[PDB]
From Swiss-Prot:
Changing E54K: In AMYLD1; early-onset amyloid polyneuropathy. The gene is TTR. Changing V30L: In AMYLD1; amyloid polyneuropathy. Changing A109T: In DTTRH; increased affinity for thyroxine. Not glycosylated under normal conditions. Following unfolding, caused for example by variant AMYLD1 'Gly-38', the cryptic Asn-98 site is exposed and glycosylated by STT3B-containing OST complex, leading to its degradation by the ER-associated degradation (ERAD) pathway. Sulfonation of the reactive cysteine Cys-10 enhances the stability of the native conformation of TTR, avoiding misassembly of the protein leading to amyloid formation. Changing E42G: In AMYLD1; amyloid polyneuropathy. Belongs to the transthyretin family. This is Transthyretin. Changing V94A: In a patient with amyloidosis.
Length: 127
């Protein structure tokens, strides 16, 4: 997919990559939800990202909605797996349809840095 059509295929896909190097993140806990008629968060999908920045299995008929989706990523367990430096606050994606005018339906999440530590040094949790 060279220059030209810089868009996705599926109706809803999750894209998680480490801004540290710009590469995709592997084994990244992700949970997708939808805006319920009661103004609540309903379960839309869930799983772990891939080295291709895509997550298969989350796709469902639920995608046939207004467009409101809430994807949450858990980096706390992502840095504990690869022993990566600590973060500040997980990144989430919450957008509503019929608001402004969205184009792509892919969730772009970058695990940007949040400290000075560079060298990959394994560390223990808060406990």
């Amino acid at each position: 997919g060279p220059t030209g059509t810089g868009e996705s295929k599926c109706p809803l896909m999750v894209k998680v990559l480490d801004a540290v190097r710009g590469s995709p993140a592997i084994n990244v806990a992700v949970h997708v939800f939808r805006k319920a008629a009661d103004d609540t968060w309903e379960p839309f999908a869930s799983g772990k990202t891939s080295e291709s920045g895509e997550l298969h299995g989350l796709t469902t008929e639920e995608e046939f909605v207004e467009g409101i989706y809430k994807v949450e990523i858990d980096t706390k367990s992502y840095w504990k797996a690869l022993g990566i430096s600590p973060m500040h606050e997980h990144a989430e994606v919450v957008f509503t349809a019929n608001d402004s005018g969205p184009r792509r339906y892919t969730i772009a999440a970058m695990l940007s840095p949040y400290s000075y530590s560079t060298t990959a040094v394994v560390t223990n949790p808060k406990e």
